Amino acid sequence: TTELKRAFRPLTPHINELDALTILVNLTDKAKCKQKLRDEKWWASCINCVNYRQSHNPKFPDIRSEGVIRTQALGELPSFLLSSSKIPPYHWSYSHDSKYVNKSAFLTNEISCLGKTCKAMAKQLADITLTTINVTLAPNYLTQISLPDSDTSYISLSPVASLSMQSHFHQRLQDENRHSAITRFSRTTNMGVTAMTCGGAFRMLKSGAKFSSPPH
DNA sequence: ACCTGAAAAGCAATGAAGCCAAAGCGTCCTGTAAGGTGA
Numbered sequence: 128t129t130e131l132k133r134a135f136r137p138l139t140p141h142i143n144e145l146d147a148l149t150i151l152v153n154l155t156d157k158a159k160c161k162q163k164l165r166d167e168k169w170w171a172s173c174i175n176c177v178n179y180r181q182s183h184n185p186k187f188p189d190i191r192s193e194g195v196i197r198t199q200a201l202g203e204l205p206s207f208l209l210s211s212s213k214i215p216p217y218h219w220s221y222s223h224d225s226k227y228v229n230k231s232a233f234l235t236n237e238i239s240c241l242g243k244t245c246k247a248m249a250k251q252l253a254d255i256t257l258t259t260i261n262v263t264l265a266p267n268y269l270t271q272i273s274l275p276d277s278d279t280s281y282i283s284l285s286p287v288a289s290l291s292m293q294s295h296f297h298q299r300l301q302d303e304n305r306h307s308a309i310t311r312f313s314r315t316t317n318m319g320v321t322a323m324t325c326g327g328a329f330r331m332l333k334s335g336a337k338f339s340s341p342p343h
Numbered sequence: 344a345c346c347t348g349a350a351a352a353g354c355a356a357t358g359a360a361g362c363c364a365a366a367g368c369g370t371c372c373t374g375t376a377a378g379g380t381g382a
Contacts, residue, residue, distance in 0.1 A: 190379065224380045317379050 135236040137218045138294045138324040151241075154232035169230075174251055176231035177242045179223035181319070183211075185262065185269065186222055187288035190317045192269055194262035195222070196287060211289035218294040220321035228320050235320075290321050297330045308333035 131150060133139050152162045155169075185194040197219075200212035217238055221231040234241045242255060262269070264285070273281040300307040308331045312318060315327040322329075 186379090193379095225378085226380070314378050 133324065135232065136324045137220050137237070137290070137321050138297055140298065141238050151233055151236065154236070155230045157229050170247055172227070173230055173233050174247065176221060176223070176227050177234045177251070178254065179221060180219060180231075180235045180240075180242065181222035181290070182216075182219055183287045183289045184220070184222045184319055184321070185287050186318060189268045190314060191267070193267040194269075195259060196262070197257055197259040199258065200289070211292045214291060214295050216291050218291045218321075220290050220319050222319045225316035228316055228323060231320060293329065294321060296332060297325055300330050300332065306333055306335055307331065 132154065134142055135151070135154065149159055149162045152158075155173075179195060181196050182198055183196045185192050185196060199216060200210055203212065204210060217240075219235070219237065219240075221228060221235055223231075242251075262285075264271075269285045272284045272286070274284060276282045309328045310331055312322065312327045312329070315322045318327075
């Protein structure tokens with residue numbers, strides 16, 4: 128049951144319609160039998176996990192930060208540059224508490240996502256609230272950069288790590304012991320689900336060989 | 344008192360480069376510190 132767990136979790140590529148959703152019930156465990164048990168407190172708390180489903184994780188270096196992001200990479204940019212627009216945007220994850228990292232596997236495992244069944248749907252559709260920025264800058268832990276716009280007057284920028292770029296880089300760099308440079312983090316369930324699967328190690332992109340300067 | 348060190352042609356062919364055997368076992372790879380949300 129470990130290969131079924133990794134296949135729905137956002138650091139493996141994606142994937143006869145009854146075996147799946149009766150496994151998706153059973154990924155809140157920490158089968159068809161407990162798939163029948165319907166707690167009204169299990170249905171109303173599972174809606175909280177899509178409410179903190181996040182596009183770009185603000186908690187990525189510092190797990191103390193505080194904010195929710197469900198937005199898309201804005202605009203378009205030329206060929207020699209590379210951002211989270213040019214890669215197809217569907218690997219998203221859960222950026223909230225470690226209490227609900229397994230209870231978020233019922234409605235945020237996502238090719239698209241699952242975001243008295245009708246009663247649940249009416250509340251979810253109204254508050255689904257996609258394309259959401261909820262950050263307050265004062266009592267949290269965010270980076271901040273002044274950069275000039277036009278002739279005068281700077282703009283403050285808070286870079287936030289996109290999740291669809293992380294799981295993209297983590298998958299392609301498996302076979303490369305030379306262009307990959309692993310950073311490990313701790314208290315990883317407070318980070319999010321997209322950091323649980325890799326175990327905390329994130330497999331960055333190193334600049335290949337060493338540096339050697341020829342005469343100029 | 345100083346100034347000079349020459350040109351012209353050549354640098355050979357024939358044959359071979361052996362094997363045979365092996366590459367040891369016993370035993371281990373340390374522990375302590377550093378949590379964000381919710382009732």
